[PDB]
Paper text:
The Integrator complex can terminate RNA polymerase II (Pol II) in the promoter-proximal region of genes. In brief, we mixed four purified subcomplexes; namely, a tetrameric subcomplex containing INTS10, INTS13, INTS14 and INTS15, hereafter called the tail module, the eight-subunit Integrator core, the cleavage module and PP2A.
SDS–PAGE and mass-spectrometry analyses showed that the Integrator–PP2A complex and NELF bound to the stalled Pol II–DSIF–Nuc complex to form a PEC–Nuc–Integrator–PP2A complex, hereafter called the pre-termination complex. However, we observed a large additional density that emerges from the N terminus of the Integrator subunit INTS5 and runs around the Integrator cleavage module towards the upstream DNA. We used focus classification to improve this density and assigned it to the tail module (INTS10–INTS13–INTS14–INTS15). The structure of the pre-termination complex reveals the previously unresolved Integrator tail module, which is shaped like the tail of a scorpion, including a sting. The observed Pol II active site is located four nucleotides (nt) upstream of our designated stall position, showing that Pol II backtracked after stalling and that the backtracked RNA was cleaved by TFIIS.
Numbering used by the authors:
A (entry chain w): 57 to 66, 74 to 105, 108 to 401, 405 to 566, 574 to 586
B (entry chain A): 530 to 769
C (entry chain A): 1299 to 1484
D (entry chain v): 4 to 36, 38 to 82, 86 to 180, 187 to 332, 338 to 388, 408 to 432, 438 to 455, 458 to 471, ...
E (entry chain A): 866 to 1102, 1117 to 1154
F (entry chain E): 2 to 210
Write the structure that this text describes.
Amino acid sequence: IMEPSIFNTLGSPENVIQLLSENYTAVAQTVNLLAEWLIQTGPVQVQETVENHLKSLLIKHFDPRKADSIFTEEGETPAWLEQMIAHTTWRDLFYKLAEAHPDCLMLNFTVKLISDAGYQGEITSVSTACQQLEVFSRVLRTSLATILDGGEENLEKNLPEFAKMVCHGEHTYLFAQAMMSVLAQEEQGGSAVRRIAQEVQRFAQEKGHDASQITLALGTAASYPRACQALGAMLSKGALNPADITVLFKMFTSMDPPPVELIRVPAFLDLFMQSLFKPGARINQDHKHKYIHILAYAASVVETWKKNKRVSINKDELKSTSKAVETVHNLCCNENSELVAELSTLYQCIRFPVVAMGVLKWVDWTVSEPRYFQLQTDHTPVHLALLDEISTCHQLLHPQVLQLLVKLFETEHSQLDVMEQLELKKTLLDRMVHLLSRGYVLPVVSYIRKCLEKLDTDISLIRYFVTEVLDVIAPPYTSDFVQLFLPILENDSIAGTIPVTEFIAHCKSNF
Amino acid sequence: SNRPVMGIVQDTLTAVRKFTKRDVFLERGEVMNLLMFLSTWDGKVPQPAILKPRPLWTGKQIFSLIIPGHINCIRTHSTHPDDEDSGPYKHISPGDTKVVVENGELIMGILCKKSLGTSAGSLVHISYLEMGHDITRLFYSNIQTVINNWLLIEGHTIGIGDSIADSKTYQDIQNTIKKAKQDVIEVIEKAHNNELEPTPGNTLRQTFENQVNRILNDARDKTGSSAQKSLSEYNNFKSM
Amino acid sequence: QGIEQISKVYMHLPQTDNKKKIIITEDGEFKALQEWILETDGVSLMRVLSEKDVDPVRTTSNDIVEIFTVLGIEAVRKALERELYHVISFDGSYVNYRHLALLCDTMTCRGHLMAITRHGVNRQDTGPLMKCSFEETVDVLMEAAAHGESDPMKGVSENIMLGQLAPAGTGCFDLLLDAEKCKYGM
Amino acid sequence: XXXXXXXXXXXXXXXXXXXXXXXXXXXXXXXXXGVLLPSLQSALPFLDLHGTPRLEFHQSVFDELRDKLLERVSAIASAEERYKKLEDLLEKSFSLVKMPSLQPVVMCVMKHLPKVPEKKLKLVMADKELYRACAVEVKRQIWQDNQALFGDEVSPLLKQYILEKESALFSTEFFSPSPKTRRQGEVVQRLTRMVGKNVKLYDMVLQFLRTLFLRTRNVHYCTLRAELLMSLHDLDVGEICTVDPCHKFTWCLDACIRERFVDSKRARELQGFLDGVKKGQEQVLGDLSMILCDPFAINTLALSTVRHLQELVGQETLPLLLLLRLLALGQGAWDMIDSQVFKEPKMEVELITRFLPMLMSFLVDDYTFNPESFTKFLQEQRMACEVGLYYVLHIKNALLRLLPGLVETFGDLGDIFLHLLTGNLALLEDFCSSLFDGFFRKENVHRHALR
Amino acid sequence: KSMESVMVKYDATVRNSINQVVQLRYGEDGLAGESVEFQNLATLKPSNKAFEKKFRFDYTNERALRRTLQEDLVKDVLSNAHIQNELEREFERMREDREVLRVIFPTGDSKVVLPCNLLRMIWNAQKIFHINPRLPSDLHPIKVVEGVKELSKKLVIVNGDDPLSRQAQENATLLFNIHLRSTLCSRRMAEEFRLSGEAFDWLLGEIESKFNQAIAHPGEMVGALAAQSLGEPATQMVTLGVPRLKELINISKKPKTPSLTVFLLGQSARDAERA
Amino acid sequence: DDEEETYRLWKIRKTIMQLCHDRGYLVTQDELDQTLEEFKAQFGDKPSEGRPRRTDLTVLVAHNDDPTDQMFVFFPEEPKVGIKTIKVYCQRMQEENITRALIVVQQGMTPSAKQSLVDMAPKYILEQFLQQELLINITEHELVPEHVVMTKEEVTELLARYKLRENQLPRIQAGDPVARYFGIKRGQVVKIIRPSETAGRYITYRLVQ
């Protein structure tokens, strides 16, 4: 062998023949020779496949066993591991090796040093990050910086890898609801991080995670026993019990304002959305008046929070929004047609923002019901024209409008005729192009690019989309938009079938 | 069709569904009376399902006595929810709707046409396959005799009360019908005044008739769903 | 423009698994592709197969005679099996494949499409008495008398008319007395 | 150990056991004093603390890198890069221990089949001496230079030619001989002995083996040729078919002759190929050897005789079957005795002109039941055809019409023919063999007992 | 009255009254239609990764293999190169069977009609022998391999040692052999069912007996049986059932609704306008 | 249309090469799967007046077993083939040692040509083929199982094994599309291999009548 050969100044005789086999002979000489030979045969791939051959043989080692008893590691393993972690495949491998045997002093002790030594972004740290404080805080800093510079689209991409880390236990959740709340309380960009905090809270609500007990004490809404106790039962139970609504109604109406952020919690307003805008919700007159008053109060008043004092209130816009919510409630609950006759005032209610997601949810609970398109006969259903007006008047609902609308586009209505199925898809594409004119450009075209390049949807719908887009838009064009749109027309499954000349003339000038 | 041509029918089928329910508990004397209509009985009275306070046997025990030898089956009852086999309680049925026979014993499940009728893979089919033909003949006769003699106790009828529903259900039926007639009137107005656009692949009469048929089919489906949802477990139409 | 004896053609996105295209992926799974198909009224199978952008492998037909003329005898056998199965399955019931296969093979074992009528069944050399039992008894018997056709009495029907034990189930063999086995008797 | 490049610790560093103060293998000198720089040498200290499993690690990496080395040869196989890769493999493959005929085996599989200076001559000679694993390169180069395939394969190959000739020399009464498709016993190994450039290798070794067979026995040359030569063109190799002038043509002609004995159409092609000029000297002799040397021609001749008699039955007269049969018999008879020279033997007026009425005599006499010309044709032609025709005629004017022909054939006598095992098998061991002893006829001793 | 004298003869071939061959085997596998059951092929549906994970025996993970087997069997499986080679050869054989099945059924339905219900039989063997699924088993996987091989050699539909009869036998029992190898795999026996040696021998005997019982007997008037089988549903019930059946049967040069099913190429089939 | 006719002729040649491959004739792989652009570049792209006329597309090929057995694939100019053109084509058939040939007709030829075909059968085996028939390969249809022509020795072995008569087998017509595809005459047997959902796969044999 290399070590068991001449143990003494000979040393076994059988091992001296074993020494002839390896030593500085073929095992060592031909290593450099073939390392230069496979290189000369073709090659940077040679060292990569060499490392792959080593890496496969590395994994067999029993690292968690022998490393526990040492307890010292000669000062953070400087001889061999400290130079090793600077290697990409090795440092990546160490994360894989840790997952095999967790709950060990050696592995959790060693990982605390590599996180700050160059591996700022610790990939596949779903469970390993939870055990160590330093690594968890470091990767949280990386996550918050990444989401902050990512913009808006990355929120879909940033949610799963980041928020799932707090699912192992609540102790990793309330701490992950602490420092960024301090960042949110400041006036210097305190809105966006509270936005991602509430988004995390809503994901917690749809993953069964209990977020109803911690977010109320975090927005200093626990200052009053009645307010916190009232809201706690609503968010924990998930319903509009009358007692809490009555105390809130008689509380906030008095000259003692609670913190405005407690009545503006998105989970609470989404709960109101679900409880009220459903067609099948039947409420008496008085409780309905209190409900519409709470929503109007939650969406009208401007308040100056000086942390000890506040003197500001508005009543007129509260009354106007109460009227709008009440009238839309009447339209939603009555359901009968005379639906077309009610658009004289319904678009006036569309102009108010608080009503827009209400009718959006009502439309979602209407169109998603099967046979609705089968029961419909118009060239364009009135509900989709309502979403067109919603897209026109406002832009904050555009991700939600697109999410509902692609949910409809991907849907198969087997009960319908095939040609009316296509005409329904073309109607949804008419909403796509309408929303494209209202500023929601990149996510829609990204959906189209995914649906065409990857999926196998009908090419006629894509062709109708491109024709409508080219016929509705005019130059100038931004470089990102032409960067996204141009591979569609270059697919050649569309170009030969029929604006096109103008677009190809302008795009080459653009790039 | 490689399935049994003959199976349990009518009175015996309804009564064996009513018999294998989880709530059926038989007194001692009733068990004595039923046990002697078994031609294949070994003469050993089984230990009761419930010993104290009162000795009560279940219909599953008696049907386990009827089932011959050690045939093994899994069958799905008609009222079995589809989502039950995905979530919790998948193999401990809250509805007793998963039939599994293990070692020739009905450990759980309610029996119907899907497990005792002509369908392939039913209890009689595997009983024939695993135990010849004479054993299955005895199986048929034992089911009929025991189940009819228990139907003397349970009884089974049908009447006017099973064809009626409360005021709420009839109000819902009338509202659904009224809305359907309103939709048909609206479609008629659209066709007459020419707001209605013909769909491709057919003429204007075909489009109008297809839409009317869709509306009335939706009305029938909704009314049937409302009526069935309004039924009670004691409804005899539902039992049949 | 187009092809004669083809009145109307309808596109269709099939929902049924049998007509939907199914392709094994690289991963080895089965993926059903909702691809367009056409259903016509009127059959000109050959021209349609020869047409452009039309899959010749999967393009089949309802008609039985013309698919025999175009594609052959084994193709019409398989197509007839498929059509018969479709008819039975539309009812929602099930019939074992053996009986469908036996019907298709019996009516395609002579090369041509043996119609189950007076015109196919009575043209085979099954024997005068079986044919007379089936239909047009007098015509078959007079033709046999003219042509001196002899009935070898190998079918069940002939022996049934003559009252002899048929070559059917319990009569497809003989019983011989085992005289040596009788030596153990008492 | 390291018998190439240099020497640091492959010999003196190979033996760590010598005296009292001579310890020093190379497990401490090798690597330190791994693969390359520390970045990739960092796995060594970490793995050396794990009980030192260094041998399986090193040999596993070497094995994986050698297998991956073999695959990249296809990139240059499909050649400036090929020359450099071959040179690198040769430099790395000059040592023992490592590259166990995988590197030099790969390089020889690429372009080192034919002999080369320092690539195929030295490497092939050493591989043949050491019995290396470069079987394709070893066989192709030994066959090219007459070292192993031509030289060392000339002993078993030349003796196998005679052994095969004796193997099908039996005189039984011939038990369903296999066709060219089923004649592949040792055909794969013999045809693959010169996979690289066996046109020259078959010219010297196989051609020399054939020339030795013609100087060894009448059956030896044809027996080995008939099996391999026809099937080689079916191997899908251009050189195998193109080596002979019409090997791809006459091999398929022979195979279809044995497939369908009666081949009136094929007789026109055979007469066109064998009846041509401008290549008479070498080509005519080679065609005679391939036409009459092979035992399959002898087995075909009996069917040709019977078909000629059947054809003459309809005409009932004598002067293309007779001309074709006489041409084949003359070519076969002249192949054994006459050398491969122009003005080929056969084509005598007496044999060809007599055998036609001799064959027609069976047709004329047989119908009258309900000839000197046969004897003249038998005397004019070779005795082997007469023996085969008489044997085939055994299986009532039909038996008496072909009589004089075969009788005069045997009486006249001969050349290379198949009238022993083929003849007797158409229709004290000495008692039956007494009649057959004159014919050579073979059915008397072996045919009677074995039948 | 058409297929009246169509009977399966004593050479297992189906022939009519004048001994013309209708089928060399009655169902094309010589099995009667009453002792045959619906069964699921566990190999046609899953992906390559899933098929390998659920059907390839792994002899490299000592821990889990020791969990599911007795330690002596663990040592025998690990030490033997011959046993590991045989297990891998069985896996490759069932992979060939998998691609053959994919060829046979381009539609991905695993429901087939085969004589012996293997899943219920394994359940019966488990229940009779009081198999504990929690404990490791005493069943040698190589015993499973050789038992399956010998069982395949025992289920005979075509008799004869000639190449033609052997080919016909391999083709007639192809589907059941694939199903038998798939169900009675070494990996499945080890992990999913946990049978014992006596239980495995009983299972093999039961499968052989039941398959032998399911063969179509000589003398069955399968013509009359087929006619009744096709006639009774017809009496029970764009063309509806009975007239379409009449058009199929009475070979009509004009049907009421002649039709084509034009399948398009891939590029056109995805586009509605060029469709 | 010019391009339409070029494509149709290319498809005809593709089906003919597949035919010759199936019949056991030595066809080069590149020509067996040549592209339409390969055909257009090779032959001239202009059948209306330019070089790729029908006689420029004549195909000759020899059997893999014997080079002597060659099949000719003819392409006449006229749609309705008269006696004169088959006569001169048969003279070309005479002057070479060929045995059997093919004729590809756009339109049905005169009946007298068919009678001439029937009477000249023993000397040479010439077969016609409508252009529409060869416009698509038939063996690739899902309904058509694979057909294998079996040799005389294989048929005798089959007949002996099953101990049945020649007439007791199932039958296929001589004018059947696949029988014409394999060019099999009376008395020839073709084995059919089809997959069955009951047994996996099944072999059937059919005599030609």
